[PDB]
Amino acid sequence: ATPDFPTHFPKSSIGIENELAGLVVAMPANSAQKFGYVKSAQGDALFMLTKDMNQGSYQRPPSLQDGKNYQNWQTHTVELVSYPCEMDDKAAVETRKQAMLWLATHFTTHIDQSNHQPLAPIQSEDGRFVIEITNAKHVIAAGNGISAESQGQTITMTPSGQQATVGVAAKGFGTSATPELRLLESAPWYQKSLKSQFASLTSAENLDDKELAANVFAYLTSIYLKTAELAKKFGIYINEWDPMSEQITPNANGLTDPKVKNAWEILPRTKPSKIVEILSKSDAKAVMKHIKPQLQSRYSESLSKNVFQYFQDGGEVAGHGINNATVGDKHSPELAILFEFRTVPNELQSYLPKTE
Numbered sequence: 006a007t008p009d010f011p012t013h014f015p016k017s018s019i020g021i022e023n024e025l026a027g028l029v030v031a032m033p034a035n036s037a038q039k040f041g042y043v044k045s046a047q048g049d050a051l052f053m054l055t056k057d058m059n060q061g062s063y064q065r066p067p068s069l070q071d072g073k074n075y076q077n078w079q080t081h082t083v084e085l086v087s088y089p090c091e092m093d094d095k096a097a098v099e100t101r102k103q104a105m106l107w108l109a110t111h112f113t114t115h116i117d118q119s120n121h122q123p124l125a126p127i128q129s130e131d132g133r134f135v136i137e138i139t140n141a142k143h144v145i146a147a148g149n150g151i152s153a154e155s156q157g158q159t160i161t162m163t164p165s166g167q168q169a170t171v172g173v174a175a176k177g178f179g180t181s182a183t184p185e186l187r188l189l190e191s192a193p194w195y196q197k198s199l200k201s202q203f204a205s206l207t208s209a210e211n212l213d214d215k216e217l218a219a220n221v222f223a224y225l226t227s228i229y230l231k232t233a234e235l236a237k238k239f240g241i242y243i244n245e246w247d248p249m250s251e252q253i254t255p256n257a258n259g260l261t262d263p264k265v266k267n268a269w270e271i272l273p274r275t276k277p278s279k280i281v282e283i284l285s286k287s288d289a290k291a292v293m294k295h296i297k298p299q300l301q302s303r304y305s306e307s308l309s310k311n312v313f314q315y316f317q318d319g320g321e322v323a324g325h326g327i328n329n330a331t332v333g334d335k336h337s338p339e340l341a342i343l344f345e346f347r348t349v350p351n352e353l354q355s356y357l358p359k360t361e
């Protein structure tokens with residue numbers, strides 16, 4: 006049992022994803038993504054050990070035949086996924102980086118003397134870190150896992166294998182109140198001009214929280230407009246909208262296609278429809294009613310209707326979202342919305358481990 010991510014943080018939170026180079030994990034087909042985790046000796050979960058990119062079917066090297074069944078097993082790259090922590094918690098950020106670098110050195114020894122064997126649950130030499138194995142039905146192998154012996158690889162990490170995910174209070178997006186919020190608001194798809202635009206459209210309206218409504222409107226409208234732009238650009242089938250009806254040839258497999266996710270740069274990871282909950286029933290109605298013409302003044306009726314309905318019925322920006330994250334008082338929790346930095350920017354590089 007790999008522990009689930011904590012969902013609540015007092016303020017902004019950060020998680021990291023780190024794909025390793027130099028080895029693979031092989032596991033039975035249709036196995037769970039998580040096969041273990043690393044915790045501090047104190048018991049705090051630091052990161053998960055996961056399979057990531059499928060690298061083809063696993064073939065046990067004949068020189069390592071052990072009478073064991075490896076039928077239908079698949080090879081994957083290994084990705085280290087941190088348990089989120091508070092963005093300003095220096096010790097927690099540092100312990101995650103150090104534990105990942107330690108595990109990479111441990112993997113370097115593992116492929117040298119225990120190639121094509123599962124990782125064992127052990128404690129680090131200095132006693133700082135502990136490996137827990139949740140799926141023993143795995144093997145770790147050097148390189149691409151075809152040869153019985155390694156090429157003496159050092160297990161490494163690189164910016165191209167790294168992402169960071171930032172979680173903030175949903176009510177904060179558009180307020181520019183913190184450096185994290187300002188970094189998120191710098192996303193090219195976010196149109197800050199929409200805040201003042203909403204205020205102009207709703208003067209005769211007596212809104213419960215006009216500034217919160219304007220922020221929600223700018224956030225949702227920016228996402229809806231960007232989705233329509235990407236659907237047109239990449240020829241994506243959204244709801245009932247057919248790109249071929251507008252003479253657009255598909256050039257992506259959908260919203261989850263890595264090139265589509267890369268085009269967001271700062272990728273929303275939370276279901277857009279969740280944000281409506283931060284407003285009163287009345288204010289939410291006013292925000293939603295005003296989004297439709299923003300799409301319709303820029304996109305065809307069919308694309309506008311389909312994007313609007315898609316997000317209204319709880320559609321996700323790019324597959325399964327992180328929709329249960331909260332911020333503030335643990336007792337009266339507030340919605341947190343998450344964002345994935347496809348490439349780690351200079352502002353967040355200090356959160357990522359660097360191979361020495």
Ligand SMILES: Nc1ncnc2c1ncn2[C@@H]1O[C@H](COP(=O)(O)OP(=O)(O)OP(=O)(O)O)[C@@H](O)[C@H]1O
Pocket residue numbers: 010011012013018019020021022086087088089090169170171172323324325326327330331341343
């Ligand atoms: N509350 C949180 N605050 C900040 N980061 C978080 C939070 N919860 C999870 N994360 C981070 O989110 C990332 C994992 O996202 P997720 O669990 O959705 O994976 P995934 O489903 O495989 O991703 P994807 O849908 O992009 O393929 C990690 O970096 C993790 O630390």
Ligand SMILES: [Mg+2]
Pocket residue numbers: 022084086
């Ligand atoms: Mg991941």
Ligand SMILES: [Mg+2]
Pocket residue numbers: 022168345
């Ligand atoms: Mg990622």
